[PDB]
A paper describes a structure:
However, it is known that the sporulation-related repeat (SPOR) domains (Pfam 05036), ubiquitous in prokaryotes, play a central role in directing proteins to the septum by recognition of the unique septal PG (rather than recognition by other division proteins), which is enriched in denuded glycans, the PG devoid of peptide stems. It is predicted to have two domains, a catalytic “double-ψ β-barrel” domain (DPBB; Pfam 03330) and a C-terminal SPOR domain. In the present report, we disclose the X-ray structure of the SPOR domain of rare lipoprotein A (RlpA) from P. aeruginosa (SPOR-RlpA).
The structure provided superb electron density for amino acids 265–342 of RlpA. The domain assembles into a concave four-stranded antiparallel β-sheet, complemented on one side by two α-helices. The β1 strand forms the central part of the fold with the adjacent β3 arranged in an antiparallel manner, and β4 and β2 contacting β1 and β3, respectively. The first repeat (residues 264–303) comprises β1, α1, and β2, while the second repeat (residues 304–342) comprises β3, α2, and β4. In addition to the hydrogen-bonding network between the β-strands, hydrophobic interactions play an essential role in linking the two repeats in a single compact structure. Therefore, our results do not support the existence of “open” and “closed” conformations as a general mechanism in SPOR domain recognition, as previously proposed.
Numbering used by the authors: 266 to 341
Write the structure that this text describes.
């Protein structure tokens, strides 16, 4: 499956907020993957697995319509 990342935040409330908003625009699973980067925690907001490239493109479109960020492909 294919995955998108929509934002990455130092503040977990901001990541959780984006996750909640994304649930209103896609049916794909939305999740936070938190990692240590540059001596801090980075909370990455991701969605997937998406079953096709065409669904990825339409999901990117929906995220932009909702003004929720710049969705980019990622490989966990």
């Amino acid at each position: 499956g294919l995955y998108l990342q929509v934002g990455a935040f130092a503040n977990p409330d901001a990541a959780e907020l984006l996750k909640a908003k994304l649930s209103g625009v896609t049916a794909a699973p939305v999740f936070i993957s938190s990692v240590v980067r540059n001596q801090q925690i980075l909370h990455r907001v991701r969605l997937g697995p998406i079953g096709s490239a065409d669904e990825v493109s339409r999901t990117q479109d929906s995220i932009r319509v909702a003004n929720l960020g710049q969705p980019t492909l990622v490989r966990p």
